[PDB]
Structure 1
């Protein structure tokens, strides 16, 4: 009897939606821009003091080439994230359109607004320009998938609204004891050889 919630993730192309999801899933940061084609659903579990909750995140394609009937992917949605890029004014100019499209299908669902890429110093959308959330009573956050700044806040806020507990807390994931099965020395030696290139491959943080 799991506590699930459908979450639609929308925004102009290049705003960092897929990078945001991957960061939450594996902790990685993808530097390449590979445009999302269609819609990809990803379960994201968070552990709370009231139990685990699962966000089935519908990662969408921001490009308008895929907007013929995008409304259908919002049906049965229970929350949503609108994402824009603070280094690209066009992405914020289109927020009202994203918000309009959502409410037309889902009406009163909790929706978070995320200004991504705040790690970059040359911020083209200034903080005083961001006003659409006040207008619609949405929760806003500056986030950075690259620096992890506030990148968990949208889910914490949505979890509190959906569960109806403003004191909900994300808590440490239980870490059960591993099984007794471990790598035998021969297999370990086989992988040290197969994966030797890893020893001479740079870490991405070296940047």
Structure 2
């Protein structure tokens, strides 16, 4: 009878930015993933547990290394939300963000979108906070991320659940089982970066 609250999420951005690494941190979603042969995609079911009940994000991760413009319409059709990703050690991935946005909005129009800057465990960072107080001003929320250490993993999913359910006080009551950190996210470096965003804001 009474079914599941489920949302289609489309994960997009340049080849090599860490999209498959980020979505694979949720272990039960990787083990139960579904290979949809004909659209070139892997659909991952990520269940999150809130104070108002359980929610599911059906994350569509492309299986190729496609280029801006080269994602069929079927990949985006009926999407309810999205995450756009770039790598902070490569400037060309961040310059392509606007074209990935243009592709989404043409097919889906006004849907809640989060912007993510990955690989902030690396010391030699090229794209900093002062240049990210830019683009995000499309009604787009920004978060610094590190996929291999699990740094800020829940933040993009918590922001999208608040918009789609309609409650700004919604919280997660327990965290999903996650793959153990494989790199070190220095604790004083993370604090320096957070201070930099507030300065930039």
**Per the shorter chain, which TM-score range?**
0.7 to 0.9
Q: Which whole-Å CA distance do the structure 2 matches of 1:180 and 1:110 have between them?
A: 31
Structure 1 pair 12/119, CA: closer, same or farther in 2 (3 Å)?
A: same
* CA spacing shift, 1:22–1:190, aligned 2, 3 Å: same
Could you list the per-position Cα deviations for residues 110-145 of structure 1 after superposition, in whole angstroms to 9, with x for gaps in the alignment? 000000001111111121111344331200000111
Over aligned residues, Cα RMSD in angstroms?
13.5
Q: Which has the larger radius of gyration?
A: 1
In the superposition, the TM-score normalised over structure 2's length comes to 0.77
* Greater length-normalized contact order (CA 8 Å, ≥ 6 residues apart): 2
| 1:9 shift after superposition | 0.2
Which range is displaced more, 102-111 or 30-39?
A: 30-39
Moved more, 102-111 or 31-40: 31-40
Instruction: Verify the 8 A CA contact 2:19 2:61 in the aligned structure 1.
Output: yes
Q: Contact conserved, 1:111 with 1:138, CA < 8 A, in 2?
A: yes
Structure 1: gaps of 5 or more residues: 200-207
Deviation at 1:148, TM superposition (A): 1.4
Conserved? CA contact 2:33–2:44, under 8 Å: no
Q: Is the Cα–Cα contact under 8 Å of residues 23 and 29 in structure 1 kept in the other structure?
A: no
Cα 1:133–1:160 change in 2 (3 A) is farther
Residue 188 of structure 1: CA displacement? Answer: 43
Q: Deviations over 1:7-27 (max 9, x none)?
A: 000010111111001112359
TM-score (norm 1): 0.75
Q: Comparing 69-78 with 42-51, which one deviates more in the overlay? A: 69-78
Tell me by how many angstroms 1:151 deviates: 1.2
| 1:8 is aligned to 2:13 | no
Q: For 2:179 and 2:145, locate their aligned partners in 1 and report how far apart those are by CA, in whole Å.
A: 34
Tell me if structure 2 keeps the 8 A contact 1:13–1:63.
yes
Number of matched residues? Answer: 199
Kept in 2, the 8 Å contact 1:115–1:141? The answer is yes
Kept in 2: contact 1:4–1:56 (CA 8 A): yes
* Cα 1:64/1:48, change in 2 over 3 Å: same
1:20-67 CA distance string (max 9 Å, x none): 011123599999999999211100000000111000000125733695
Question: Compared with structure 1, are the counterparts of its residues 62 and 108 closer, same or farther at alpha carbon in structure 2 (3 Å cutoff)?
Answer: farther
